[PDB]
Design a protein around this nucleic acid. Sequence first.
RNA 1: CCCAUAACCUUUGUACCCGUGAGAAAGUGCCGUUGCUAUGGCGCGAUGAUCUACCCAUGGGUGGGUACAAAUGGCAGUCUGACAAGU
Lengths: 242, 255, 123, 147, 380
Amino acid sequence: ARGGAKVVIEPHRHAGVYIARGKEDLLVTKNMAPGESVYGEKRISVEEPVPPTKVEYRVWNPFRSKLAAGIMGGLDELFIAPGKKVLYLGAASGTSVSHVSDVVGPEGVVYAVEFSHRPGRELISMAKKRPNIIPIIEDARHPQKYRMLIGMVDCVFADVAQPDQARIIALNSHMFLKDQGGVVISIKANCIDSTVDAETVFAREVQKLREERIKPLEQLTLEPYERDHCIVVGRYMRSGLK
Amino acid sequence: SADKVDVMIIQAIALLDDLDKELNTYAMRCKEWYGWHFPELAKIVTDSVAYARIILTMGIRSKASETDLSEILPEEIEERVKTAAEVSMGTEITQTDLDNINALAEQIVEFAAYREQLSNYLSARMKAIAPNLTQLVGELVGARLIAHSGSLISLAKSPASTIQILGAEKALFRALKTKHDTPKYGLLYHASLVGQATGKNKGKIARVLAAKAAVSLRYDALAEDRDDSGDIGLESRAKVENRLSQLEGRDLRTT
Amino acid sequence: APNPKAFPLADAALTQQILDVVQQAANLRQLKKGANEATKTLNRGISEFIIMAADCEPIEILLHLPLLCEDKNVPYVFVPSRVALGRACGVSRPVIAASITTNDASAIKTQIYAVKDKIETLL
Amino acid sequence: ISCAKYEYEVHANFKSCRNIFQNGLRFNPDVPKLWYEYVKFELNFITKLINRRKVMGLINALRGDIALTIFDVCMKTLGKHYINKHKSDSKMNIELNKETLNYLFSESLRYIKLFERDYLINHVLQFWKNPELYLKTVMIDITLNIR
Amino acid sequence: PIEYLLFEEPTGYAVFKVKLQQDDIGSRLKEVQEQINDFGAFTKLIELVSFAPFKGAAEALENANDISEGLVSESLKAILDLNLPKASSKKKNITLAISDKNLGPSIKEEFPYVDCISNELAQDLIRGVRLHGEKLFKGLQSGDLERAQLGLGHAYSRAKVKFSVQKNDNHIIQAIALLDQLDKDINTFAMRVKEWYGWHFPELAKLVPDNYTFAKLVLFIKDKASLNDDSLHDLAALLNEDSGIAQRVIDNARISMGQDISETDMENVCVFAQRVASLADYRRQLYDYLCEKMHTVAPNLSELIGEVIGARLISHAGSLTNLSKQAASTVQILKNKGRISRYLANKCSMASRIDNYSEEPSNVFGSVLKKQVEQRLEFY
RNA sequence: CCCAUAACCUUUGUACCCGUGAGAAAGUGCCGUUGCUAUGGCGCGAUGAUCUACCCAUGGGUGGGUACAAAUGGCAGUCUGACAAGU
């Protein structure tokens, strides 16, 4: 709540992410870049035992990040792990890419891929601060444009709003994803098509991915924060979907 | 005599800790600028004087590929830095900003050598004022002792077990008000002798060192004709060596 | 080779249609006027879409918005006359940026959605 | 170089050696040593053919120009290579320009040590011009005419 | 008939010769996909024939840009010449596997006798090359793929955003925070030198107020003894004699009762004062440079309010971006004076946005804004 | 060792203080130029009008805060005390 209360931290079922419990509950992560707030977010910090050194944890804004509803809503298995590599289709800014850097931690890496320049400027300055994030400023439909820069990524996330969504995830996954890999989609009915209903759009898109050889494990609706979305968690199998 | 000034000695120790603190934050600022430039130095080495001397030596990654860096850093670290220069993640930085980083690294080297010179002044003055103490326990902890409990004659007036305590008074009074175990070392942990010992031996060496230090202190501050050498200090050290050697040589596992 | 940063401007037809919808919004309280209020509205997240002009003195005051609009995936269009925009707004002065806010309880909701669809097509 | 030296010192199939050298310069133009050995091999084929024409006459400058033009494309390529080797302000550009020119002309004097010899170096000097370095050049001019 | 495949790496290019082309018609089967997974059969499929790396970081950047657009580079043409055999243009075109169906035309128009292939076969094999990666290269490829990757990523992103150094402001943030720390330490070292020489001269401690004249005085005057007429004259060339402080300090030096400090306290307070004066010179220089970089980056701020005030504003902002993105309604700068400050805050918001997004400023409009500021000031 | 190298209060040094969004004020108003009347400037704004204790007739002294400084003010008092180790 206010900027003074004392709270308790807790390791989650998913690694990396922690629960911040006090009088009220929060979703928190560990920050690599100390002391620096990206978008004004209130931060917790702890001493840790040499004298103890100060580390810092950061709230994960559930009204703002389109992945935040994933953990609060509760996915069975999120493939982002404290050692793997994540491909990120559509980093608007720090608002999500910095948090995915914080959950993948030091050893892992994150590739932000985005096209519009001025978010590119904010991106590259943010990566200049934080050393696990490498941004690429190209269009998300041509891994043949950028195929020298990414080596065998472990799990793909996507939050693009363009109507090309199934095809572009199919392209990037077929290029760079490991076998038995993980894929997370954040899909918005209003930005694929309006008149047909949202759930029918969801069925259409999940059917398109099943055609594109990625078998979906589960979906979540993310009702209480933003209206009308879905988060799809699926597995790149490439070999015998059945 | 115009060399016996405890107020200058305590001003020295307070200045010493402040100087270390401000050196640390200044090296932080330099690290952040040259991390907006080129951070693999800041991730390979951390030692402030050596980092700043690299900054004084070379000024750009091409210059690093040109230059040699033998005497500042060992060569495997040097060439790893060179490989980081050959594959950097950085920009190129303007002339005026290079000049300012140069001036800052100059500041850092000056503060480091300045701090070493101030410690030299502290140690020589310590040997001038309370010589037996400097022969026995170490001038850093000697200055810290006088600084904690005030001045020389009062520190002499207090007895030996108090001198074994002096530091951890918070833990002491909490432990006595709550009826738990008293703390043993307190402040005398930072002596070279206790650094030689280990464990329950550290407890015994702690009380022994406090006692012989109390003899050194009472002879030192309340004498008329001090020889200014410290043979009393040396003999206390020798007896302490005998005691430490015997207690470490004593075996606990059966033979 | 690079565009002027007021990318993109619209047809005269889309300009006419947008000016009518913003005038009806001015009638029904769901139009808010002014770049400052546009910025606060984007921060509150209650902004549906953004009209901008391309003629004020100069245009970086209005050019701060594309960052926020692309930040929250909000459609933003351009019209070449701040004085025609003010006439549409029904105010005593030319306006450089206007926000159509969010309400699902509207009389012109469908027209808002229609023109928003047009914007997303022309983007 | 090992390939060329084999094919020349045992066989002297100078044509295949030359094509080896062409593709070698193509793969690595950046190597002043490779430029050095190619110029050496050119001059050795020249003096071999000239001793052959001499022993022909006894039993009874084109080459310098191709050497100097090889020197030309050498210098241009090396200059561009070290420009692109860390290509950025106005004063940065001026000082690094002076550094690069020092580099190239040190290397040109290395070729002078490798040494119509006077005419070849005079071409190098007018090529050079078109401070203390200026004095070094005019020193080389007058001492070369004494030579 | 998929004889050669061509891979590109953050270090360089490489070409592989195929041995055993997979039977295609089953390429949707579990078994051929597990052979594309495991290392056990991939080395049965593909052998190494050549690999030529780049020799410079700028060269890697330029070649990567070249591929990304789709034209062929000099290194690539040389590799193809030294690798691909001499084939015909009418019968048995030599077949090269290649990932980029749009790069295909340039290779075909370059070398007449090679047919590019971008089939799912080729996607399969090049995917396998990416997976088994460094483990295939037998030890040839030196230097981390990871570090080469990261360097090339930063370079490519910067070159396609057209990054600068002028439109950075982290120098402003760090320089102003350093300036604050310098002034804090310079006043605390003023207090410490004040007392630590006041044990020699409390008369000085009360006589002279300025820290810089304090340091200059304990520079020049050694102690309260070695004081003479030319010392008084050079003190007049220093702080003043006409203030009478010179007469006061020499008479208090005659009548002073503190310890005449010895040679070592003397040299130590000397080294202290010299260190403090050096830090003061550095701080003055760095402040002047801060004015310089403000007139460089965003001098509409210095135009409307001032250099250090705009700089304190950017440091509270976190960056020029966030100074712009902050709205003119919740800006906190430093009833009626509230009206004035509300107004100039709005004007400053306009100034920040223009000098943020605009490349180089409009101080004529800065002048308009400041003259309007003085006009609303003459209103109230 | 987690901080008496301080933490907290208290006493003195430095400070200013009760987000909303279209409504305010209510030949000439004040000057300029030119002579045998012609006339020069401006008269609200979306780029934002308006809201964000106690005494004495635009002074002080009380009243309360947070960010910064000094205290040899306060909480606040300095462990046990005759065996051990080898044969």
